[PDB]
């Protein structure tokens, strides 16, 4: 069910990502609302593309966790917390994380380009 | 800065691709303008997808450079030229290059399909 896992812990909630992914896309004011929904969808897909995550729902990266953003144990984050509480905790550092992800992908793409240059 | 590298050489300018990529997407006439901007964005993303470059900003291919399109040295193109001068030089051959890229990706996808068929 759409958002059925919203109150579920992060671990169990991560198993239903396709339900929300499918639901996100599925007068002049209504047409504006539809265009805005499309623009928001594309902004999220573009952002995933910038990070090298264009085809994945669960995308692993090379950016280390600082631990200052959140110093909780991994089992506490995934087994005891919900995604809403986690977002409330990380929203102060979300732009920092996004900037690091963009820089990491730019470095990875340059490194792959150089490896491909070697004959 | 958005287009800050426009007057910079191709080499240095290639390091800021995410700035323009993010800026490209970020009454009835205004709604038409927004829909057109979305359609143009999607046309570029579709074209990258056709070439097998859907998730990359710097995408390496298997199409050789003919040298008739431009016979400049690699250091001249990347260290002395800007992207605007380069586009002015290649616009006469851009459709040829795009056609070759599409054909190359179709051949690559068929070859991968056949390699995957081998058990």
């Amino acid at each position: 069910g759409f958002l059925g896992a919203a109150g579920s812990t992060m671990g169990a909630a991560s198993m239903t990502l396709t339900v929300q992914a499918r639901n996100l896309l599925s007068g002049i004011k209504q047409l504006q609302a539809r265009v805005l929904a499309v623009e928001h969808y594309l902004r999220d897909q573009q952002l995933l593309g910038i990070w090298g995550c264009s085809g994945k729902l669960i995308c692993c990266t090379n950016v280390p966790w600082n631990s200052s953003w959140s110093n909780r144990n991994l089992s506490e984050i995934w087994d005891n917390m919900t995604w809403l509480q986690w977002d409330k905790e990380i929203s102060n550092y979300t732009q920092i994380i996004y900037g690091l992800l963009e820089e990491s992908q730019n470095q990875q793409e340059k490194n792959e380009q150089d490896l491909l240059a070697l004959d | 800065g958005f287009l800050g590298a426009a007057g910079s050489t191709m080499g240095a300018a290639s390091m800021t691709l995410t700035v323009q990529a993010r800026n490209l997407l970020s009454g009835i006439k205004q709604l038409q303008a927004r829909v057109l901007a979305v359609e143009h964005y999607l046309r570029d993303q579709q074209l990258l997808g056709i070439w097998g470059c859907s998730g990359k900003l710097i995408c390496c291919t298997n199409v050789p450079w003919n040298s008739s399109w431009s016979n400049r040295n690699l250091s001249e193109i990347w260290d002395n030229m800007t992207w605007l001068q380069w586009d002015k030089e290649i616009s006469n051959y851009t459709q040829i290059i795009y056609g070759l890229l599409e054909e190359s990706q179709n051949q690559q996808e068929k070859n991968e399909q056949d390699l995957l068929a081998l058990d």
Partner: antibody
């Protein structure tokens, strides 16, 4: 036209470690890949390691792949090599050299364009 | 390693060739075989880069060539000032980057 000077120690015990460092002058350090090449006292010279111009990519010869770390600092214009488990087979004069690779947008090299004079490391 | 003669000699003014023999994956497939001139007690200097090119500052006496899987350095106009240990260096690939031969004493 350019200067490249090796700094390093001498005799070490087997099983230890030693950091070598080279300083560059006369060319843009960040524009060229750097390598280490070594020559045993009685043998010819052989390639040891290669680092790209940015420093993100490193490559090693198999005989040292699990011990040596190659690193560069483009703000200091220096190249460092941290060696561990110096074996008797690793005794050699270690030269820094400019060349060996190019970052895709530059003309190819696959040669060592400039050389230093060499640090002598013994075991 | 690459195969080189342990010693080559000739009279002053003679054209002297130093062979470098490798396998199909070293000299044959990749046309990136360089030559270095090492004087005793000194670091090697680059004489030839690519199969046929000379760095600026190196005279035209040093002429490189390649045939099949064998590379060669021809030194015309032999003089005592150019006596040194010569080495060939070939690009082997992405898994193995460079292979050097033994020194040739001239």
């Amino acid at each position: 036209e350019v200067q490249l000077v090796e700094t390093g120690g001498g005799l070490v015990q087997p099983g230890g470690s030693l950091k070598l460092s080279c300083r560059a002058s006369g060319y843009t350090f960040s524009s060229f890949a750097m390598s280490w090449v070594r020559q045993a006292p009685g043998k010819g010279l052989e390639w040891v390691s290669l680092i790209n111009d940015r420093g993100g990519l490193t490559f090693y010869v198999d005989s040292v792949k699990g011990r040596f770390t190659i690193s560069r600092d483009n703000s200091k214009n220096t190249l460092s090599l941290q060696m561990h488990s110096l074996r008797d087979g690793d005794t050699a004069v270690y030269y820094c050299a400019t060349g060996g690779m190019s970052s895709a947008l530059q003309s190819s090299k696959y040669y060592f364009d400039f050389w230093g004079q060499g640090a002598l490391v013994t075991v | 390693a690459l195969t080189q003669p342990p010693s080559v000699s000739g009279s002053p003014g003679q054209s002297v060739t130093i062979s470098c023999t490798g396998t199909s994956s070293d000299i044959g497939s990749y046309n990136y075989v360089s030559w270095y001139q090492q004087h005793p007690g000194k670091a090697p200097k680059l004489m030839i880069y690519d199969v046929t090119q000379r760095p600026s500052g190196v005279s035209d006496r040093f002429s490189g060539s390649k045939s099949g899987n064998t590379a060669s350095l021809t030194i015309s106009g032999l003089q005592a000032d150019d006596e040194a240990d010569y080495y060939c260096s070939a690009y082997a690939g992405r898994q193995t980057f460079y292979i050097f031969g033994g020194g040739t004493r001239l």
